Amino acid sequence: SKHSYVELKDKVIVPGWPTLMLEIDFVNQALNIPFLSVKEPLQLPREKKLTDYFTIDVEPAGHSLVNIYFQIDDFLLLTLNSLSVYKDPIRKYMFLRLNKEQSKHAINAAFNVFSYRLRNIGVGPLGPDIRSSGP
Amino acid sequence: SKHSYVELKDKVIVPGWPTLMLEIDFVNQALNIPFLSVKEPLQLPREKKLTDYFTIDVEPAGHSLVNIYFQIDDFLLLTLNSLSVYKDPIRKYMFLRLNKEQSKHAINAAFNVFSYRLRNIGVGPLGPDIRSSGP
Amino acid sequence: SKHSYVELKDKVIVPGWPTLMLEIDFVNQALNIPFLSVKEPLQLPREKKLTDYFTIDVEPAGHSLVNIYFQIDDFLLLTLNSLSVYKDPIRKYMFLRLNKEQSKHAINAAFNVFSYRLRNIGVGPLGPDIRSSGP
Amino acid sequence: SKHSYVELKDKVIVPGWPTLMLEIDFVNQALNIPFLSVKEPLQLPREKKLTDYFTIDVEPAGHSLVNIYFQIDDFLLLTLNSLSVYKDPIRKYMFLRLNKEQSKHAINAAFNVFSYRLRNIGVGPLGPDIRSSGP
Ligand SMILES: Nc1ccn([C@@H]2O[C@H](COP(=O)(O)O)[C@@H](O)[C@H]2O)c(=O)n1
Ligand SMILES: Nc1ccn([C@@H]2O[C@H](COP(=O)(O)O)[C@@H](O)[C@H]2O)c(=O)n1
Ligand SMILES: Nc1ccn([C@@H]2O[C@H](COP(=O)(O)O)[C@@H](O)[C@H]2O)c(=O)n1
Ligand SMILES: Nc1ccn([C@@H]2O[C@H](COP(=O)(O)O)[C@@H](O)[C@H]2O)c(=O)n1
Numbered sequence: 011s012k013h014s015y016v017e018l019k020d021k022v023i024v025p026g027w028p029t030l031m032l033e034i035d036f037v038n039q040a041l042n043i044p045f046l047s048v049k050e051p052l053q054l055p056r057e058k059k060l061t062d063y064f065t066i067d068v069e070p071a072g073h074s075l076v077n078i079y080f081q082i083d084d085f086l087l088l089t090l091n092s093l094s095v096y097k098d099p100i101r102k103y104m105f106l107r108l109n110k111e112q113s114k115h116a117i118n119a120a121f122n123v124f125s126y127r128l129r130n131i132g133v134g135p136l137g138p139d140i141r142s143s144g145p
Numbered sequence: 146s147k148h149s150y151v152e153l154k155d156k157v158i159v160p161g162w163p164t165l166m167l168e169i170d171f172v173n174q175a176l177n178i179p180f181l182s183v184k185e186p187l188q189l190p191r192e193k194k195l196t197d198y199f200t201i202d203v204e205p206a207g208h209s210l211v212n213i214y215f216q217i218d219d220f221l222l223l224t225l226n227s228l229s230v231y232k233d234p235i236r237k238y239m240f241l242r243l244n245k246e247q248s249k250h251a252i253n254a255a256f257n258v259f260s261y262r263l264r265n266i267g268v269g270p271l272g273p274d275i276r277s278s279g280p
Numbered sequence: 281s282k283h284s285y286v287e288l289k290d291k292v293i294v295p296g297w298p299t300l301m302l303e304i305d306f307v308n309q310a311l312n313i314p315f316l317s318v319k320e321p322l323q324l325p326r327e328k329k330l331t332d333y334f335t336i337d338v339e340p341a342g343h344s345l346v347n348i349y350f351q352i353d354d355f356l357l358l359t360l361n362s363l364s365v366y367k368d369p370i371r372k373y374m375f376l377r378l379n380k381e382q383s384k385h386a387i388n389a390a391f392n393v394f395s396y397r398l399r400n401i402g403v404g405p406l407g408p409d410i411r412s413s414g415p
Numbered sequence: 416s417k418h419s420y421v422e423l424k425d426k427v428i429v430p431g432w433p434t435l436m437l438e439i440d441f442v443n444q445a446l447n448i449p450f451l452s453v454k455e456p457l458q459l460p461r462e463k464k465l466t467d468y469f470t471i472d473v474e475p476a477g478h479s480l481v482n483i484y485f486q487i488d489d490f491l492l493l494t495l496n497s498l499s500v501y502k503d504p505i506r507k508y509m510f511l512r513l514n515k516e517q518s519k520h521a522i523n524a525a526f527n528v529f530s531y532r533l534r535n536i537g538v539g540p541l542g543p544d545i546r547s548s549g550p
Contacts, residue, residue: 043387074179136335200541209513290477293476313478406486
C-alpha cells in the first residue's frame, strides 16, 4: 500500500530539553543535525546496532537543496516516541529538510553516505529554566 | 530573432531518481549543482566531448547573487529531454539561479570558468520507495 | 514566578555607533555576534569577571537553527541599559536567534560552551555621519 | 544639511555586462562584491589612488547582518554614472547590504578594514547574447 513520507518538522526540537543528534559521515564531509528533543537518553539494546531499525537516504530536491529520508522500524519508533518531548511525532516513513547551508555539504559529497549514528546531547546550565518558563 | 533564457526551475529535480550533476571548476574553487533528474544515465557519443553541445556562462545578478547561463545544442537537448523525469523541460537558451551560499564561490573566483563536466549520480537505498510513494 | 525570555531583536544594534561583541568559544569553533550598540565602552568593575553577572545558554530550536539564552544580573543589566543607544532594551531573561549560517557552528560544536567574553568594538571613519544622518 | 544614505540596490548589476568588483581586505579575511555593472572599464586618473574619491565604512546593522557605507566624491560619482549600465544610480552618500553569508566574514574580522580596491571584471562567452536577449 501507498505511504506518505511525513515531514519531521522543527517543532520536534523543543529548547531547554536534551536532544539526540543525527551524525552523518559522507565520502571527510560531515553533517550534524538536531534530530529529536528527548526527555531520556536513547539506548540501543546492549549489543544491537542502529543499522538494524534505522536506515537513511540523502537525496537532492533542487539545485542546492537536499532532503534526508528515514526508514524507522517498530522497535525504534516506539522507543523514540516514548522518549520524545513533543507528542508522538515519529512515523515509519519520514523526511527532514536540510537548509541551503547544510545541503551544500551533502551535494559536495555526491549524496554518498558512509556511516551514521545517533548521539545523546546534554542540556545547558539554564536548561531547567528554559523549558519551564515558556511564552 | 529574440529568445528568452528560460529558468530551469528546481522541479526538474525529483527526489528518488538518479540525477546528473553539473561540476564546475573556476580559477581551486569548486561548484557542484544537481542539474537534472534522469531515468537513464547520460552518455556523450563515444569520443565526443561535452564542450561541443554545451557551453555555460557564470554571471552576477546582484551584490552577492549569481546566475549560470546555458547554450544547449540540438543533439544534447533532445537526449536530455528524453532522459528527463519531469516533462521535457530543457530549452536551447536557459539559466539557473545560485543561492547566496554558492554565489559566494563564483564571485570569489571572479566568474572565471576553467572546466565543466556532467556526471551521473546514483540513487539511495530507499530511492525506489521515495519516487513511488508520493504525497 | 513565571518569566518570559524576551527576544533581543536586531534593533538594539544601530549603525554608526560603537558596539560590544559577544565572543563565544565552544569545544576550536568560534562565534562572534554584535550583541548591543552602546554610547560608551563597557567596563566590568576592576577585578571582577563577566561570569559573575552574565551566564549564557546555547540551545537548538530546530534541525539547523540555534538560540542563545541569557541570565543577566542587576548590576550588569543596569550598566548595559545606561550604555545602550536604543531605549533600555535589556531584560533579566533574554534570548537572541542565530541564523542558519551561525547555527551550524554551534551544532558542529555540540552546543558545548568553553568560554565567553564581551568586547568593545570601535566605529568606522564615516560613523559620526552615519548615526546623525538617518532616513 | 541632512542627507540620506541611499541604498545601492541589486538592479545596478545587470547580467551580461562587464562589472567592477569591490575587493575588501580586513584584519586575512576577504570580501568580494559585485559593485556596479559598467559598459566601459574604470580608470582612476593615471597616478591617483582610489582612496582620494572613495572611502568605505563597514558597520553592523543586526546580530549577524552587516552594511557597507560609501563616501563618493564628485569626480568618481560622475565617472561611475557615465560608465554605469543602469540609469545614473550612484549618489554621494550610499550603502549596500551584505547577506548573512558575507556579514559573517566582516564580523569575524571585527569590522576593521585594512585595504580596498575596485577591479574591472570581464564578461562571459555568452555575455553578448545575455544582455541583448531580455525577458
Ligand atoms: N557539516 C560540515 C561542517 C563543516 N564542514 C567543513 O567543510 C570542510 C570541507 O573539507 P575540506 O576543507 O577538506 O575541503 C571541512 O574541513 C569542514 O571543516 C563540512 O565538511 N561538513
Ligand atoms: N563549491 C565549493 C564548496 C566548498 N569550497 C571550499 O572553499 C575553500 C576555498 O579554498 P581555500 O580554502 O584554498 O581558500 C575550499 O578549500 C573548499 O573546501 C569551495 O571552494 N567551493
Ligand atoms: N564563527 C566561526 C566562523 C568560522 N569558523 C571556521 O570554521 C572552521 C572550522 O574548523 P576546522 O577548519 O578545524 O574544521 C574554522 O577553521 C573557522 O575558520 C568557525 O568555526 N566559527
Ligand atoms: N570573503 C571571504 C570568503 C572566504 N573566506 C574564507 O574563510 C577563511 C577564514 O580564514 P581561516 O581559514 O584562516 O580561519 C579563509 O581561509 C577563506 O577561505 C573569507 O575569509 N572571506
